Design an enzyme around this catalytic site. Structure first.
Site: not given
Length: 108
Positions: A27, A37-38, A57, A83, A100
Site C-alpha cells: 500500500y 504518510f505511509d 482503520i 482517524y 490508499f
C-alpha cells in the site's frame, strides 16, 4: 460513503479476504494534498493484517474485503472511516480523507 474502492487493476474475482482471514497487501497512503504518510512499497515489504479485527482503520477492514487477490485499487477513506476529527499526531491531521493505493497479494 465510508470507503470507496476504485479498481486500478482487476484481481482474480474469486479469492476475497473474509472476516478473520489474513490479507497481505502492498500500500501507499496519501493525504488530500498528496503528502505520503505511509507506504509499504517504500519500505519494500508487504503488510499483513487480520480482516475485521480493527487492527487497521475501518475503511481498510471494509475496503480490503471488497478486493480479490491480484487486484490493485484505490481505497478512499472518509474521516469517519479513518482517524476522524482526532487525526494521528505527527502522522495524520484532523478530519483527513485518506487515499490508499492497495494491491492484495494473498489471503491466508
Amino acid at each position: 460513503m465510508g470507503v470507496q474502492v476504485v479498481t486500478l487493476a482487476a484481481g482474480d474475482e474469486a479469492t476475497y479476504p473474509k472476516a478473520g482471514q489474513v490479507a497481505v497487501v502492498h500500500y501507499t497512503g496519501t493525504l488530500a494534498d498528496g503528502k505520503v504518510f505511509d507506504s509499504s512499497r517504500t519500505r519494500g515489504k508487504p503488510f499483513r493484517f487480520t480482516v475485521g479485527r480493527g487492527e487497521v482503520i475501518r475503511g481498510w477492514d471494509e475496503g480490503v474485503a471488497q478486493m480479490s487477490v491480484g487486484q490493485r485499487a484505490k481505497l478512499v477513506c472518509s474521516p469517519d472511516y479513518a482517524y476522524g476529527s482526532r487525526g494521528h499526531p505527527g502522522v495524520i491531521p484532523p478530519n483527513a480523507t485518506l487515499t490508499f493505493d492497495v494491491e492484495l497479494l494473498r489471503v491466508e
